[PDB]
TrEMBL record, chain A:
Native source organism of the sequence: Staphylococcus phage 812
Domain of life: Viruses
Protein name according to UniProt: Non-cytoplasmic protein
UniProtKB/TrEMBL annotation, chain B:
Organism: Staphylococcus phage 812
One Pfam match: SP10_terminator
Taxonomy, superkingdom: Viruses
InterPro entries recorded: SP10_terminator (IPR056960)
Protein name: Baseplate hub assembly protein
């Protein structure tokens, strides 16, 4: 008995994964080649992906690397109001 | 030792600022209180090893054009004398001493002693990290190297120590004459974008906080005070305004000069008189 429902987006950012190694990028060099890795989603080279930050330039070389798999990490909070009768 | 506060500020700021802007974690720690938009924009523009945009720092009145996207501007400011000692005497030294140096030095084995080598000779040893030599160890300094007894310490043959020491210049002795000076130096960040100026000011504040652990200002430039001005349009005659928030830094330093002494007594002439 969902009386009302609402959704909120807290974060929306891109995170990259190596196809074979299964790790997530955390650091890059001056040439923008990967230097480090982590197996933790909470610590990754996050690229903002909100409305204002689309069409970036910082990570063009990183994107074109075929070994990397971009992922849209999105965090949400949803409020649900229940009326359960008496 | 005459003090040039501006040069010290520049030398402390440049590598430290570069290191701070190198990584994202420190910047995120710094900009915790700021909103998402300005924080992320500044991080995109300046932060990271591969940042395309870059900040700069330099003195005032440069004859060349200076980048106004983000720059740290320094000017010398006023100064005042605050305290003095009797006869302007600050300290007395038996051996001429220069700057205080910190050097890492791995332990080495010598036939009777463990030793550490150093780049330059030693005038005085202040501290060896995590060591309190006893009488048994018989700590001795012999020019470049410091040494302690081999046998009872033989477990530590390769101890990865580090040393805080002082350079040696001459064997002469003299007096230190000088006074204390209370100096003010002005620092302002410039940017045609006000949010960039705000973030730049915050970074400046953080590096000033971090500097307080530095050896030089711990020994030379104590009593740091800060004061911030209002965000104002630095220039209005361009196509777009320059916005900056001046900050005033205060320091206390001892301007001094070494007065050598050539008098050395080595003989005595105790004789009586007759009448």
């Amino acid at each position: 008995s969902i009386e009302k429902k609402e959704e909120v987006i807290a974060h929306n950012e891109v995170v990259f994964r190596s196809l074979t190694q299964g790790l997530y990028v955390k650091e890059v060099d001056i040439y923008s080649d990967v230097v480090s890795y982590t197996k933790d989603v909470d610590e990754a080279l996050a690229m903002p992906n909100t409305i204002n930050f689309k069409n970036s330039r910082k990570y063009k070389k990183l994107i074109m690397n075929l070994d990397l798999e971009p992922l849209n990490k999105i965090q949400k909070v949803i409020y649900e109001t229940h009326l359960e009768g008496l | 030792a005459i003090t040039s506060v501006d040069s010290y500020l520049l030398s402390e700021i440049k590598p430290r600022l570069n290191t701070v802007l190198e990584n994202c974690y420190i910047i995120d720690e710094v900009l915790k209180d700021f909103d998402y938009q300005t924080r992320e924009s500044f991080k995109e523009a300046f932060c990271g090893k591969n940042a395309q945009h870059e900040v700069t720092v330099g003195f005032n009145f440069p004859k060349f054009k200076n980048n106004y996207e983000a720059h740290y501007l320094i000017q010398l400011g006023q100064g005042q004398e605050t305290k003095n000692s009797l006869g302007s005497i600050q300290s007395s030294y038996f051996e001429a001493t220069g700057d205080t140096l910190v050097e890492s030095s791995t332990a080495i084995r010598e036939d009777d002693k463990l030793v550490f080598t150093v780049s330059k000779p030693i005038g005085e040893l202040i501290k060896v990290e995590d060591i309190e030599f006893a009488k048994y160890d018989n700590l001795q300094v012999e020019g470049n190297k410091v040494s302690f007894k081999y046998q009872t310490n033989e477990d530590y043959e390769n101890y990865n120590a580090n040393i805080i020491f002082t350079e040696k210049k001459n064997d002469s002795k003299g007096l230190v004459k000088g006074f204390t000076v209370e100096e003010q130096v002005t620092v302002v960040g410039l940017s045609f974008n006000v949010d960039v100026a705000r973030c730049l000011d915050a970074v400046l504040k953080m590096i000033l906080i971090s500097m307080r652990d530095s050896i030089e200002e711990q020994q030379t430039f104590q009593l740091q005070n800060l004061s911030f001005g209002d965000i104002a349009p630095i220039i209005e005659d361009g196509d777009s305004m320059i916005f900056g928030r001046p900050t005033i830094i205060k320091y206390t330093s001892s301007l001094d000069l070494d007065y050598t002494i050539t008098q050395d007594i080595n003989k005595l002439t105790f004789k009586e008189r007759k009448d």
